[PDB]
Amino acid sequence: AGFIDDSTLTGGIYYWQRERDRKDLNPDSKDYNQYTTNLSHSTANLSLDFASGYAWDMFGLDVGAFTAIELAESSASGHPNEIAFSSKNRTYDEDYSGDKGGVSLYKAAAKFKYGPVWARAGYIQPSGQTLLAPHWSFMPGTYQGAEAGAKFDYGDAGALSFSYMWADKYKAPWHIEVDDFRQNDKKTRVSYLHSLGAKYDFKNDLVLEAAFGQAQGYVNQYFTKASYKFDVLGNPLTTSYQFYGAEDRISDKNDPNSIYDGLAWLQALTFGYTTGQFNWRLEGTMVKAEGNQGFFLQRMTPTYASSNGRLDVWWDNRSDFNANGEKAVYAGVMYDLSNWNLPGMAVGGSYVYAWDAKPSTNPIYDQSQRLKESAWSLDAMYTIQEGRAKGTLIKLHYTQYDNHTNIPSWGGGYGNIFQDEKDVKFMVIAPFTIF
Ligand SMILES: CCCCCCCCOCCOCCOCCOCCO
Ligand SMILES: [Ca+2]
Ligand SMILES: [Ca+2]
Ligand SMILES: [Ca+2]
């Protein structure tokens, strides 16, 4: 046992091919009503990760890097596509002008263990109980910072986990260099993000989680979750209630750095149910997000790509369904084809219906607007089950998204809503072990 004995060297080959076409309702467009190219690219990633063992069972090191390789990109494809690297190397230099290949050092961390306590420092991903999170493409984003936590297992009485994380820079996986954190104006600095959270597992399928976070001088962020599982008619019903909240520290609602008025939140209820080869999902969300921004963010810095935060609800139906006032219901099914002697293969689909979405409360926007949006998707996926390629994911995802207004994308006070789309994503994720 130790630094070398327990070392691993692993990697990944990743392939992404996407066609996303979006209806253009920009008033002066020559292609008004047409589904023009929004994304059209073919891109690979390659990753390699060294993870040491623990010298003296207390000290180790992880180093990971990845490259992006561009096979094809239409001149009309938008930027950044989040699989290649943005042509701009840091968060706040983003101008949406290009994508490129490159290489990024995405993990470079000292790791520590001392009794029940653990820590990681350097270029790290959040790994404990806080509400800080990386963005995920094929690879995760990278914080410059440190996290420490502990776990106390009380056996029958349950297990407690908690951790604290602090960071002063970040890069999304589409940026090669870390940037600092700033307010909405992309100028006023935010000297750190930090977060504290906890989890208690009662060992009877009840799990409680909670976390608090701050962007220095700017945003307070909240998370709570209760999860439970029990049988309904002989089959497991999994349930969760989730609360996500945020407030800024700029009360003046017309200040350009004010993003929320009072407390903003996203609340969710989820149910999952398995019957034979079918896995069913029924989920719903509701949002309050008064203020200039007009939608809820799980991340504590508002600028695109600038950080991320924990959000357990993911419907893969293109829209975030997170506008001020918006309510949304999701229904989905996946069918395991093992009984057709296609083990590892699954197919499914899903549907979202959302309504009551309101714009930003900034008075320059028409406050009478109420927006509905809906979507459906289809899924086909295979996980290879034997051979050197065991664990490889091959997946095709297809979405039709419908914005039930004529508002041009990102317009009308709906700064996070875009127009109708057809989206086709094909991906291969092939992990491999060197030692
Ligand atoms: C310590 C973990 C607690 C997780 C359970 C959710 C409690 C979060 O409360 C936030 C405020 O919620 C507003 C009230 O909404 C109705 C409550 O929904 C069901 C609560 O289980
Ligand atoms: Ca380019
Ligand atoms: Ca405010
Ligand atoms: Ca429409």
Side-chain angles (χ1 to χ4, degrees), residues 1-385 387 389-435:
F3 190 90
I4 299 295
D5 286 347
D6 303 321
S7 90
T8 62
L9 184 61
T10 55
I13 302 164
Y14 319 77
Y15 177 68
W16 181 273
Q17 195 181 316
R18 185 175 201 170
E19 171 182 355
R20 193 168 79 199
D21 306 316
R22 179 183 296 169
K23 187 194 278 186
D24 179 359
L25 299 189
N26 298 334
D28 296 340
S29 172
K30 293 351 288 168
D31 291 304
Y32 193 94
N33 283 317
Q34 302 279 86
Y35 286 76
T36 63
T37 291
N38 181 254
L39 287 174
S40 174
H41 68 104
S42 166
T43 314
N45 289 180
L46 304 166
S47 67
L48 193 66
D49 270 273
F50 172 77
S52 77
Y54 288 88
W56 321 288
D57 200 28
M58 286 187 300
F59 169 83
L61 298 164
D62 299 339
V63 180
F66 75 98
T67 66
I69 299 156
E70 299 181 299
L71 287 83
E73 179 189 73
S74 167
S75 44
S77 193
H79 314 288
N81 62 47
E82 299 185 353
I83 308 300
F85 291 107
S86 180
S87 65
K88 310 315 269 195
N89 284 336
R90 303 171 184 195
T91 303
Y92 291 103
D93 294 322
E94 186 59 72
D95 68 355
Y96 306 102
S97 65
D99 284 89
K100 64 181 178 164
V103 61
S104 177
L105 176 74
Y106 87 100
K107 193 181 314 189
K111 56 190 174 180
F112 302 93
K113 288 180 347 180
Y114 192 64
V117 179
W118 61 269
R120 302 176 59 84
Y123 273 13
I124 64 166
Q125 290 75 44
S127 59
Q129 293 67 57
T130 85
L131 58 64
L132 278 168
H135 297 93
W136 273 97
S137 289
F138 286 130
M139 319 302 311
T142 308
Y143 291 93
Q144 177 175 273
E147 186 174 13
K151 182 172 174 188
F152 298 101
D153 190 353
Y154 306 107
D156 300 322
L160 167 72
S161 304
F162 59 86
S163 73
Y164 171 81
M165 181 170 166
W166 176 100
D168 61 355
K169 299 195 177 180
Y170 177 77
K171 58 185 173 175
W174 55 95
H175 286 296
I176 289 160
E177 295 174 19
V178 294
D179 212 346
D180 68 347
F181 305 117
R182 307 180 200 176
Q183 299 187 1
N184 203 66
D185 66 3
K186 307 194 287 171
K187 301 178 157 199
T188 302
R189 289 334 205 239
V190 163
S191 62
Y192 59 86
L193 309 180
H194 67 170
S195 185
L196 177 70
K199 170 170 65 182
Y200 201 87
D201 183 342
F202 292 91
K203 315 270 180 85
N204 58 5
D205 302 307
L206 177 66
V207 178
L208 301 183
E209 297 166 277
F212 174 73
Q214 300 179 300
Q216 175 270 317
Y218 194 47
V219 167
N220 298 325
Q221 198 90 21
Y222 308 89
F223 164 69
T224 72
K225 177 174 188 189
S227 305
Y228 190 51
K229 174 174 109 66
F230 60 93
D231 268 9
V232 169
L233 292 142
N235 291 308
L237 180 65
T238 62
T239 68
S240 89
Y241 164 80
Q242 300 163 38
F243 175 81
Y244 303 86
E247 57 194 1
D248 71 28
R249 308 182 64 180
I250 302 179
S251 308
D252 180 8
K253 70 167 48 60
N254 299 318
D255 187 305
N257 284 304
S258 175
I259 53 175
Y260 305 119
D261 296 349
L263 183 68
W265 45 256
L266 182 155
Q267 295 178 257
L269 197 63
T270 71
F271 303 96
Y273 192 64
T274 300
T275 68
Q277 299 302 286
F278 296 86
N279 292 327
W280 304 93
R281 291 175 58 190
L282 180 67
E283 309 184 351
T285 63
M286 171 165 187
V287 167
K288 180 182 184 173
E290 296 182 354
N292 283 329
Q293 189 164 273
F295 52 91
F296 182 81
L297 284 175
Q298 69 269 30
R299 67 172 179 266
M300 302 189 282
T301 50
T303 303
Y304 172 65
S306 61
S307 70
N308 202 21
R310 182 163 171 180
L311 173 57
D312 289 2
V313 175
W314 168 233
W315 293 340
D316 205 359
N317 268 286
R318 278 299 299 131
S319 172
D320 297 322
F321 304 103
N322 71 345
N324 180 30
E326 188 167 20
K327 298 152 240 182
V329 179
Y330 163 93
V333 67
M334 299 279 333
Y335 181 63
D336 178 325
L337 294 164
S338 39
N339 289 352
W340 306 21
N341 195 226
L342 298 164
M345 187 77 185
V347 292
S350 66
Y351 173 68
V352 178
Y353 180 93
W355 71 104
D356 248 354
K358 304 191 281 176
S360 165
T361 58
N362 185 330
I364 66 167
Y365 303 114
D366 173 7
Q367 302 297 299
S368 68
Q369 290 172 107
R370 303 285 186 279
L371 174 152
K372 305 195 185 68
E373 46 175 344
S374 62
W376 56 262
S377 300
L378 299 173
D379 276 288
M381 58 194 311
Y382 184 30
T383 302
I384 293 181
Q385 313 260 295
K390 195 262 201 184
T392 294
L393 170 65
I394 306 171
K395 177 172 159 132
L396 183 71
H397 186 80
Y398 175 52
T399 302
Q400 292 200 3
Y401 165 77
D402 194 357
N403 176 326
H404 294 284
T405 75
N406 298 332
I407 297 168
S409 295
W410 321 117
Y414 294 96
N416 199 44
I417 282 165
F418 46 81
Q419 263 298 326
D420 298 359
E421 287 183 346
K422 297 190 184 23
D423 188 33
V424 182
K425 294 177 283 180
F426 175 62
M427 64 196 77
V428 180
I429 301 169
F432 60 82
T433 296
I434 296 185
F435 61 73

PDB file of all heavy atoms in Angstrom, residues 6 42 90 95 102 131 151 190-191 202 226 243 272 286 288 298 303 318 337 339 344 374 402 408-409 412 424 429 435:
ATOM      1  N   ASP A   6      -0.758   1.902  -4.751  1.00  0.00           N
ATOM      2  CA  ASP A   6      -2.174   2.158  -4.987  1.00  0.00           C
ATOM      3  C   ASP A   6      -2.407   3.202  -6.072  1.00  0.00           C
ATOM      4  O   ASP A   6      -3.540   3.669  -6.226  1.00  0.00           O
ATOM      5  CB  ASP A   6      -2.845   2.593  -3.675  1.00  0.00           C
ATOM      6  CG  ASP A   6      -2.680   1.560  -2.570  1.00  0.00           C
ATOM      7  OD1 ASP A   6      -2.769   0.363  -2.882  1.00  0.00           O
ATOM      8  OD2 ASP A   6      -2.452   1.930  -1.396  1.00  0.00           O
ATOM      9  N   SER A  42     -18.223  18.508 -34.874  1.00  0.00           N
ATOM     10  CA  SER A  42     -17.745  17.165 -34.566  1.00  0.00           C
ATOM     11  C   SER A  42     -16.421  17.328 -33.837  1.00  0.00           C
ATOM     12  O   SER A  42     -15.473  17.898 -34.397  1.00  0.00           O
ATOM     13  CB  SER A  42     -17.574  16.334 -35.838  1.00  0.00           C
ATOM     14  OG  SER A  42     -16.819  15.166 -35.585  1.00  0.00           O
ATOM     15  N   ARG A  90     -10.091  32.700 -20.934  1.00  0.00           N
ATOM     16  CA  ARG A  90     -10.589  32.917 -19.592  1.00  0.00           C
ATOM     17  C   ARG A  90     -12.041  33.372 -19.604  1.00  0.00           C
ATOM     18  O   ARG A  90     -12.476  34.100 -20.506  1.00  0.00           O
ATOM     19  CB  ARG A  90      -9.789  33.996 -18.849  1.00  0.00           C
ATOM     20  CG  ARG A  90      -8.307  33.716 -18.751  1.00  0.00           C
ATOM     21  CD  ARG A  90      -7.600  34.937 -18.191  1.00  0.00           C
ATOM     22  NE  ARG A  90      -6.159  34.740 -18.161  1.00  0.00           N
ATOM     23  CZ  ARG A  90      -5.319  35.499 -17.467  1.00  0.00           C
ATOM     24  NH1 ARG A  90      -5.781  36.506 -16.735  1.00  0.00           N
ATOM     25  NH2 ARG A  90      -4.022  35.244 -17.494  1.00  0.00           N
ATOM     26  N   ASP A  95     -16.285  36.273 -25.723  1.00  0.00           N
ATOM     27  CA  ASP A  95     -17.067  37.106 -26.627  1.00  0.00           C
ATOM     28  C   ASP A  95     -17.827  36.270 -27.650  1.00  0.00           C
ATOM     29  O   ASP A  95     -18.411  36.836 -28.583  1.00  0.00           O
ATOM     30  CB  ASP A  95     -16.168  38.142 -27.316  1.00  0.00           C
ATOM     31  CG  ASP A  95     -15.194  37.520 -28.282  1.00  0.00           C
ATOM     32  OD1 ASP A  95     -15.126  36.283 -28.363  1.00  0.00           O
ATOM     33  OD2 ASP A  95     -14.487  38.279 -28.972  1.00  0.00           O
ATOM     34  N   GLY A 102      -6.985  22.345 -28.197  1.00  0.00           N
ATOM     35  CA  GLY A 102      -6.002  22.738 -27.202  1.00  0.00           C
ATOM     36  C   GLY A 102      -5.803  21.674 -26.140  1.00  0.00           C
ATOM     37  O   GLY A 102      -6.267  20.540 -26.268  1.00  0.00           O
ATOM     38  N   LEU A 131     -22.358  23.079  -1.967  1.00  0.00           N
ATOM     39  CA  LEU A 131     -23.127  23.366  -3.171  1.00  0.00           C
ATOM     40  C   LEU A 131     -22.272  23.943  -4.291  1.00  0.00           C
ATOM     41  O   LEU A 131     -22.807  24.272  -5.345  1.00  0.00           O
ATOM     42  CB  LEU A 131     -24.302  24.297  -2.866  1.00  0.00           C
ATOM     43  CG  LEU A 131     -24.112  25.679  -2.235  1.00  0.00           C
ATOM     44  CD1 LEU A 131     -23.332  26.630  -3.113  1.00  0.00           C
ATOM     45  CD2 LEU A 131     -25.501  26.256  -1.936  1.00  0.00           C
ATOM     46  N   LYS A 151     -15.970  12.411   7.702  1.00  0.00           N
ATOM     47  CA  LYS A 151     -17.113  11.508   7.753  1.00  0.00           C
ATOM     48  C   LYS A 151     -17.051  10.782   9.085  1.00  0.00           C
ATOM     49  O   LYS A 151     -15.977  10.335   9.493  1.00  0.00           O
ATOM     50  CB  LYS A 151     -17.121  10.493   6.605  1.00  0.00           C
ATOM     51  CG  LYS A 151     -18.357   9.579   6.658  1.00  0.00           C
ATOM     52  CD  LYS A 151     -18.511   8.696   5.433  1.00  0.00           C
ATOM     53  CE  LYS A 151     -19.670   7.719   5.621  1.00  0.00           C
ATOM     54  NZ  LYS A 151     -19.732   6.698   4.532  1.00  0.00           N
ATOM     55  N   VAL A 190     -15.058  39.602  -7.094  1.00  0.00           N
ATOM     56  CA  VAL A 190     -15.602  38.747  -6.041  1.00  0.00           C
ATOM     57  C   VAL A 190     -14.387  37.921  -5.616  1.00  0.00           C
ATOM     58  O   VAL A 190     -13.885  37.115  -6.402  1.00  0.00           O
ATOM     59  CB  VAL A 190     -16.750  37.860  -6.549  1.00  0.00           C
ATOM     60  CG1 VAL A 190     -17.024  36.699  -5.585  1.00  0.00           C
ATOM     61  CG2 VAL A 190     -18.014  38.683  -6.789  1.00  0.00           C
ATOM     62  N   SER A 191     -13.867  38.165  -4.411  1.00  0.00           N
ATOM     63  CA  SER A 191     -12.526  37.669  -4.086  1.00  0.00           C
ATOM     64  C   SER A 191     -12.493  36.161  -3.845  1.00  0.00           C
ATOM     65  O   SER A 191     -11.449  35.528  -4.049  1.00  0.00           O
ATOM     66  CB  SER A 191     -11.978  38.414  -2.863  1.00  0.00           C
ATOM     67  OG  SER A 191     -12.794  38.172  -1.741  1.00  0.00           O
ATOM     68  N   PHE A 202     -29.464   8.038   7.306  1.00  0.00           N
ATOM     69  CA  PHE A 202     -30.009   7.313   8.446  1.00  0.00           C
ATOM     70  C   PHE A 202     -30.012   5.802   8.247  1.00  0.00           C
ATOM     71  O   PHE A 202     -30.511   5.078   9.115  1.00  0.00           O
ATOM     72  CB  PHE A 202     -31.428   7.775   8.733  1.00  0.00           C
ATOM     73  CG  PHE A 202     -31.530   9.177   9.241  1.00  0.00           C
ATOM     74  CD1 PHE A 202     -31.688  10.243   8.362  1.00  0.00           C
ATOM     75  CD2 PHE A 202     -31.481   9.432  10.600  1.00  0.00           C
ATOM     76  CE1 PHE A 202     -31.804  11.541   8.838  1.00  0.00           C
ATOM     77  CE2 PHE A 202     -31.596  10.717  11.079  1.00  0.00           C
ATOM     78  CZ  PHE A 202     -31.766  11.774  10.206  1.00  0.00           C
ATOM     79  N   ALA A 226     -34.236  16.289   0.778  1.00  0.00           N
ATOM     80  CA  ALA A 226     -34.628  15.074   1.486  1.00  0.00           C
ATOM     81  C   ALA A 226     -34.940  14.009   0.446  1.00  0.00           C
ATOM     82  O   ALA A 226     -35.664  14.273  -0.519  1.00  0.00           O
ATOM     83  CB  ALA A 226     -35.831  15.329   2.399  1.00  0.00           C
ATOM     84  N   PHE A 243     -34.698  21.983  -2.451  1.00  0.00           N
ATOM     85  CA  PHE A 243     -34.822  23.431  -2.370  1.00  0.00           C
ATOM     86  C   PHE A 243     -33.488  24.057  -2.749  1.00  0.00           C
ATOM     87  O   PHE A 243     -32.451  23.669  -2.197  1.00  0.00           O
ATOM     88  CB  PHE A 243     -35.210  23.897  -0.959  1.00  0.00           C
ATOM     89  CG  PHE A 243     -35.215  25.378  -0.824  1.00  0.00           C
ATOM     90  CD1 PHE A 243     -36.294  26.113  -1.266  1.00  0.00           C
ATOM     91  CD2 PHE A 243     -34.118  26.052  -0.308  1.00  0.00           C
ATOM     92  CE1 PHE A 243     -36.292  27.484  -1.179  1.00  0.00           C
ATOM     93  CE2 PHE A 243     -34.115  27.430  -0.222  1.00  0.00           C
ATOM     94  CZ  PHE A 243     -35.198  28.140  -0.660  1.00  0.00           C
ATOM     95  N   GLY A 272     -39.186   8.411  -8.833  1.00  0.00           N
ATOM     96  CA  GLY A 272     -38.696   7.410  -9.771  1.00  0.00           C
ATOM     97  C   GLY A 272     -39.266   6.058  -9.400  1.00  0.00           C
ATOM     98  O   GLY A 272     -39.426   5.744  -8.225  1.00  0.00           O
ATOM     99  N   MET A 286     -40.713  24.475  -9.593  1.00  0.00           N
ATOM    100  CA  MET A 286     -41.309  25.803  -9.584  1.00  0.00           C
ATOM    101  C   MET A 286     -40.211  26.783  -9.215  1.00  0.00           C
ATOM    102  O   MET A 286     -39.374  26.474  -8.358  1.00  0.00           O
ATOM    103  CB  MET A 286     -42.467  25.883  -8.576  1.00  0.00           C
ATOM    104  CG  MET A 286     -43.009  27.296  -8.355  1.00  0.00           C
ATOM    105  SD  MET A 286     -44.627  27.319  -7.521  1.00  0.00           S
ATOM    106  CE  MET A 286     -45.059  29.033  -7.596  1.00  0.00           C
ATOM    107  N   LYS A 288     -39.124  30.985  -8.331  1.00  0.00           N
ATOM    108  CA  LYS A 288     -39.323  32.408  -8.107  1.00  0.00           C
ATOM    109  C   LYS A 288     -37.986  33.095  -8.346  1.00  0.00           C
ATOM    110  O   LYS A 288     -36.972  32.694  -7.764  1.00  0.00           O
ATOM    111  CB  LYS A 288     -39.807  32.722  -6.690  1.00  0.00           C
ATOM    112  CG  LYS A 288     -40.004  34.235  -6.483  1.00  0.00           C
ATOM    113  CD  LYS A 288     -40.436  34.575  -5.065  1.00  0.00           C
ATOM    114  CE  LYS A 288     -40.722  36.067  -4.923  1.00  0.00           C
ATOM    115  NZ  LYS A 288     -41.308  36.382  -3.584  1.00  0.00           N
ATOM    116  N   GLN A 298     -28.302  28.187 -10.072  1.00  0.00           N
ATOM    117  CA  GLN A 298     -27.718  27.379  -9.009  1.00  0.00           C
ATOM    118  C   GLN A 298     -26.286  27.792  -8.697  1.00  0.00           C
ATOM    119  O   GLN A 298     -25.747  27.378  -7.669  1.00  0.00           O
ATOM    120  CB  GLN A 298     -27.767  25.899  -9.393  1.00  0.00           C
ATOM    121  CG  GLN A 298     -26.843  25.524 -10.544  1.00  0.00           C
ATOM    122  CD  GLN A 298     -27.514  25.619 -11.911  1.00  0.00           C
ATOM    123  OE1 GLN A 298     -28.411  26.435 -12.123  1.00  0.00           O
ATOM    124  NE2 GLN A 298     -27.074  24.785 -12.841  1.00  0.00           N
ATOM    125  N   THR A 303     -22.319  35.446 -14.436  1.00  0.00           N
ATOM    126  CA  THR A 303     -21.818  35.406 -15.802  1.00  0.00           C
ATOM    127  C   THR A 303     -21.674  33.967 -16.276  1.00  0.00           C
ATOM    128  O   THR A 303     -21.268  33.077 -15.521  1.00  0.00           O
ATOM    129  CB  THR A 303     -20.474  36.133 -15.916  1.00  0.00           C
ATOM    130  OG1 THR A 303     -20.627  37.486 -15.464  1.00  0.00           O
ATOM    131  CG2 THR A 303     -19.973  36.125 -17.366  1.00  0.00           C
ATOM    132  N   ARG A 318     -33.275  20.548 -23.203  1.00  0.00           N
ATOM    133  CA  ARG A 318     -32.700  21.777 -23.735  1.00  0.00           C
ATOM    134  C   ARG A 318     -32.927  23.008 -22.872  1.00  0.00           C
ATOM    135  O   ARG A 318     -31.959  23.607 -22.408  1.00  0.00           O
ATOM    136  CB  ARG A 318     -33.204  22.034 -25.156  1.00  0.00           C
ATOM    137  CG  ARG A 318     -32.415  21.233 -26.213  1.00  0.00           C
ATOM    138  CD  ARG A 318     -30.914  21.603 -26.227  1.00  0.00           C
ATOM    139  NE  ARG A 318     -30.745  23.013 -26.552  1.00  0.00           N
ATOM    140  CZ  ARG A 318     -29.993  23.889 -25.882  1.00  0.00           C
ATOM    141  NH1 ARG A 318     -29.276  23.520 -24.827  1.00  0.00           N
ATOM    142  NH2 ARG A 318     -29.958  25.147 -26.287  1.00  0.00           N
ATOM    143  N   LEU A 337     -33.357  -3.278 -22.605  1.00  0.00           N
ATOM    144  CA  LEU A 337     -33.630  -4.290 -23.618  1.00  0.00           C
ATOM    145  C   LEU A 337     -32.953  -5.627 -23.328  1.00  0.00           C
ATOM    146  O   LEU A 337     -32.787  -6.446 -24.238  1.00  0.00           O
ATOM    147  CB  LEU A 337     -33.206  -3.778 -24.994  1.00  0.00           C
ATOM    148  CG  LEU A 337     -34.021  -2.584 -25.492  1.00  0.00           C
ATOM    149  CD1 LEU A 337     -33.307  -1.905 -26.643  1.00  0.00           C
ATOM    150  CD2 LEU A 337     -35.395  -3.033 -25.922  1.00  0.00           C
ATOM    151  N   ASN A 339     -34.043  -8.235 -21.892  1.00  0.00           N
ATOM    152  CA  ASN A 339     -34.907  -9.374 -22.185  1.00  0.00           C
ATOM    153  C   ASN A 339     -35.104  -9.618 -23.677  1.00  0.00           C
ATOM    154  O   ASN A 339     -35.684 -10.644 -24.049  1.00  0.00           O
ATOM    155  CB  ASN A 339     -36.275  -9.194 -21.531  1.00  0.00           C
ATOM    156  CG  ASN A 339     -36.214  -9.336 -20.036  1.00  0.00           C
ATOM    157  OD1 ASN A 339     -35.179  -9.710 -19.478  1.00  0.00           O
ATOM    158  ND2 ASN A 339     -37.320  -9.034 -19.369  1.00  0.00           N
ATOM    159  N   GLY A 344     -27.337  -4.214 -21.854  1.00  0.00           N
ATOM    160  CA  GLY A 344     -26.615  -2.968 -21.964  1.00  0.00           C
ATOM    161  C   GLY A 344     -27.287  -1.925 -22.827  1.00  0.00           C
ATOM    162  O   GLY A 344     -26.878  -0.756 -22.787  1.00  0.00           O
ATOM    163  N   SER A 374     -42.310  23.878 -23.971  1.00  0.00           N
ATOM    164  CA  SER A 374     -42.452  22.437 -23.816  1.00  0.00           C
ATOM    165  C   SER A 374     -41.428  21.748 -24.701  1.00  0.00           C
ATOM    166  O   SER A 374     -40.819  22.364 -25.579  1.00  0.00           O
ATOM    167  CB  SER A 374     -43.874  21.987 -24.164  1.00  0.00           C
ATOM    168  OG  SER A 374     -44.153  22.292 -25.518  1.00  0.00           O
ATOM    169  N   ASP A 402     -40.032  23.501 -27.987  1.00  0.00           N
ATOM    170  CA  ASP A 402     -41.010  24.467 -28.481  1.00  0.00           C
ATOM    171  C   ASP A 402     -41.196  25.601 -27.473  1.00  0.00           C
ATOM    172  O   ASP A 402     -41.722  25.399 -26.374  1.00  0.00           O
ATOM    173  CB  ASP A 402     -42.351  23.783 -28.785  1.00  0.00           C
ATOM    174  CG  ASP A 402     -43.284  24.653 -29.619  1.00  0.00           C
ATOM    175  OD1 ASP A 402     -42.935  25.804 -29.931  1.00  0.00           O
ATOM    176  OD2 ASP A 402     -44.390  24.182 -29.955  1.00  0.00           O
ATOM    177  N   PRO A 408     -37.794  36.739 -29.841  1.00  0.00           N
ATOM    178  CA  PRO A 408     -36.458  36.348 -30.297  1.00  0.00           C
ATOM    179  C   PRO A 408     -35.633  35.804 -29.149  1.00  0.00           C
ATOM    180  O   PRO A 408     -35.776  36.227 -28.002  1.00  0.00           O
ATOM    181  CB  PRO A 408     -35.856  37.652 -30.837  1.00  0.00           C
ATOM    182  CG  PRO A 408     -37.020  38.555 -31.057  1.00  0.00           C
ATOM    183  CD  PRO A 408     -38.045  38.183 -30.030  1.00  0.00           C
ATOM    184  N   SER A 409     -34.741  34.879 -29.479  1.00  0.00           N
ATOM    185  CA  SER A 409     -33.964  34.186 -28.461  1.00  0.00           C
ATOM    186  C   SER A 409     -33.303  35.201 -27.541  1.00  0.00           C
ATOM    187  O   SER A 409     -32.739  36.204 -27.996  1.00  0.00           O
ATOM    188  CB  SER A 409     -32.913  33.287 -29.106  1.00  0.00           C
ATOM    189  OG  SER A 409     -33.520  32.235 -29.840  1.00  0.00           O
ATOM    190  N   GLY A 412     -37.047  39.944 -24.808  1.00  0.00           N
ATOM    191  CA  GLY A 412     -38.314  40.195 -24.151  1.00  0.00           C
ATOM    192  C   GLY A 412     -38.291  40.195 -22.642  1.00  0.00           C
ATOM    193  O   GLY A 412     -39.358  40.205 -22.017  1.00  0.00           O
ATOM    194  N   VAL A 424     -29.790  17.167 -31.877  1.00  0.00           N
ATOM    195  CA  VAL A 424     -29.348  15.787 -32.024  1.00  0.00           C
ATOM    196  C   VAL A 424     -27.921  15.712 -31.498  1.00  0.00           C
ATOM    197  O   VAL A 424     -27.017  16.373 -32.035  1.00  0.00           O
ATOM    198  CB  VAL A 424     -29.403  15.320 -33.486  1.00  0.00           C
ATOM    199  CG1 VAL A 424     -28.996  13.875 -33.598  1.00  0.00           C
ATOM    200  CG2 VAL A 424     -30.786  15.516 -34.051  1.00  0.00           C
ATOM    201  N   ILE A 429     -18.235   7.694 -25.031  1.00  0.00           N
ATOM    202  CA  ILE A 429     -17.367   7.885 -23.869  1.00  0.00           C
ATOM    203  C   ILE A 429     -16.723   6.533 -23.582  1.00  0.00           C
ATOM    204  O   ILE A 429     -17.415   5.591 -23.180  1.00  0.00           O
ATOM    205  CB  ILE A 429     -18.124   8.406 -22.634  1.00  0.00           C
ATOM    206  CG1 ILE A 429     -18.797   9.736 -22.962  1.00  0.00           C
ATOM    207  CG2 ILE A 429     -17.172   8.500 -21.426  1.00  0.00           C
ATOM    208  CD1 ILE A 429     -19.773  10.210 -21.903  1.00  0.00           C
ATOM    209  N   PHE A 435      -2.651   1.481 -15.903  1.00  0.00           N
ATOM    210  CA  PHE A 435      -2.341   0.593 -14.771  1.00  0.00           C
ATOM    211  C   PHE A 435      -3.205   0.982 -13.573  1.00  0.00           C
ATOM    212  O   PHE A 435      -3.334   0.244 -12.589  1.00  0.00           O
ATOM    213  CB  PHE A 435      -0.847   0.610 -14.412  1.00  0.00           C
ATOM    214  CG  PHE A 435      -0.302   1.943 -13.981  1.00  0.00           C
ATOM    215  CD1 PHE A 435      -0.606   2.476 -12.737  1.00  0.00           C
ATOM    216  CD2 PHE A 435       0.574   2.637 -14.801  1.00  0.00           C
ATOM    217  CE1 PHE A 435      -0.073   3.692 -12.339  1.00  0.00           C
ATOM    218  CE2 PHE A 435       1.109   3.847 -14.410  1.00  0.00           C
ATOM    219  CZ  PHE A 435       0.789   4.377 -13.179  1.00  0.00           C
TER     220      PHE A 435
END
